[PDB]
Amino acid sequence: LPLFHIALLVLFMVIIYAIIGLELFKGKMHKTCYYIGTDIVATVENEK
Amino acid sequence: RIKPVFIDDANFRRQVSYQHAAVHIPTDIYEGSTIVLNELNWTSALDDVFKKNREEDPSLLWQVFGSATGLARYYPASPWVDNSRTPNKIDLYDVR
């Protein structure tokens, strides 16, 4: 019963940061390093 | 190892050495197991038969003993077409 206001303060910080990130980084992480003329994404041993 | 002399021949469009027999071991088989080093120890008695077969009929092409451990001992000695990693083409040849 007492943890109400803190949860209501977290629910709006998540909502504010979601909208900020939606403004700034929307549709930016969509290109990557493919092999030339291929659909095999190029990485190294431990690189995601 | 052995550093062979490798004259160049016809009847084999490559360079062969009639002095000893060459050995092929699959790439993913260690040469240095106890099983492999025991096949290389008793197959060394084949080279006299290899040579005698070849001297009775000089028109004879490869002679090979392909062993059940992966080895292939052939005569006359001649470098394998593919070094596994010295060029970027690795070879998958298993005698079995």
């Binding site: - | 790439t27 993913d28 260690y30 040469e31 240095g32 990693r85 690795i90």
Partner: protein, 48 residues
């Protein structure tokens, strides 16, 4: 390979899990980084 006498030589790895796209790698008997051999190593591991 399960003992150090077997873990010698080379072996094939398959990229993307494809049986026709392989690479040679020397195989080596590797020790973990946080192991439990002595009590100092066990204590480091338990710390992490």
């Amino acid at each position: 390979k399960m003992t150090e006498e077997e873990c010698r030589g080379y072996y094939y790895v398959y990229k993307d899990g494809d049986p026709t796209q392989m690479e040679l790698r020397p195989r080596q008997w590797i020790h973990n980084d946080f192991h439990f051999d002595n009590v100092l190593s066990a204590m480091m591991s338990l710390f992490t």
